[PDB]
């Protein structure tokens, strides 16, 4: 091969979290929402097969799979935790997926709600032609 | 700033 290529795509992870003015009967003090998206509302579904949110073990059904945009989870709870997020690619070759450990932190009563954004850049060195055309459609 | 407890 004479030529080679590196394709770069941008992801945006983030979450919002707001103190409820009255906790639920379970003691859930917060409503929060975590998401994975592209910037400028770009269509990352062109190359994203699914997004898996691994919630803390205390949750029921902690494996939350989003096969279509929006890639997000909305929940109520009482404490922050590390949230591993797996972004699976429409790619038979490697890399098959990528992983981010997302800090889902919550703020105290009386303070502003959490609004956090994490920008991540992915680089794919010499993808297959089929995966490359998907990456470039995004 | 200050944050809640964590699942721990």
Swiss-Prot record, chain A:
Organism domain of life: Eukaryota
Mutagenesis or variant effect for residue 58 to A: Decreased binding to crotonylated histone H3. Decreased binding to acetylated histone H3
Record localization: Nucleus; Chromosome
Disulfide bonds: none
The YEATS domain, residue ranges: 1-138
Gene this protein is translated from: MLLT3
Tissue: Enriched in undifferentiated hematopoietic stem cells in fetal liver, cord blood and bone marrow.
Positions bearing the site annotation: Histone H3K9cr binding: 58, 103
Domain notes: The YEATS domain specifically recognizes and binds acylated histones, with a marked preference for histones that are crotonylated. Also binds histone H3 acetylated at 'Lys-9' (H3K9ac), but with lower affinity. Binds crotonylated lysine through a non-canonical pi-pi-pi stacking mechanism. The YEATS domain also binds DNA.
Known role: Chromatin reader component of the super elongation complex (SEC), a complex required to increase the catalytic rate of RNA polymerase II transcription by suppressing transient pausing by the polymerase at multiple sites along the DNA. Specifically recognizes and binds acylated histone H3, with a preference for histone H3 that is crotonylated. Crotonylation marks active promoters and enhancers and confers resistance to transcriptional repressors. Recognizes and binds histone H3 crotonylated at 'Lys-9' (H3K9cr), and with slightly lower affinity histone H3 crotonylated at 'Lys-18' (H3K18cr).
Subunit (UniProt): Component of the super elongation complex (SEC), at least composed of EAF1, EAF2, CDK9, MLLT3/AF9, AFF (AFF1 or AFF4), the P-TEFb complex and ELL (ELL, ELL2 or ELL3). Interacts with BCOR. Interacts with CBX8. Interacts with ALKBH4.
Coiled-coil parts of chain: none
Disease implication from the record: A chromosomal aberration involving MLLT3 is associated with acute leukemias. Translocation t(9;11)(p22;q23) with KMT2A/MLL1. The result is a rogue activator protein. Fusion protein KMT2A-MLLT3 interacts with MEN1 and PSIP1. A chromosomal aberration involving MLLT3 was observed in a patient with neuromotor development delay, cerebellar ataxia and epilepsy. Translocation t(4;9)(q35;p22).
Histone H3K9cr binding, as annotated region: 78-80, 106-108
Effect of residue 28 to A: Decreased binding to crotonylated histone H3. Decreased binding to acetylated histone H3
Protein's name according to its UniProt entry: Protein AF-9
């Amino acid at each position: 091969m004479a030529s080679s290529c590196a394709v770069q795509v941008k992801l945006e992870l983030g979450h919002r979290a707001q103190v409820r003015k009255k906790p639920t009967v379970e003691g859930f003090t917060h409503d929060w929402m975590v998401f994975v998206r592209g910037p400028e509302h770009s269509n990352i579904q062109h190359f994203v097969e699914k997004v898996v949110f691994h919630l803390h073990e205390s949750f029921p059904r902690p494996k939350r799979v989003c096969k279509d945009p929006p890639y997000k989870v909305e929940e109520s709870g009482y404490a922050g935790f590390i949230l591993p997020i797996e972004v699976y690619f429409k790619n038979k070759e490697e890399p098959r997926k990528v992983r981010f450990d997302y800090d889902l932190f919550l703020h105290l009563e009386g303070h502003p709600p959490v609004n956090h954004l994490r920008c991540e850049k992915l680089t794919f060195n010499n993808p297959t032609e089929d995966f490359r055309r998907k990456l470039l459609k995004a | 700033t200050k944050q809640t407890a964590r699942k721990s």
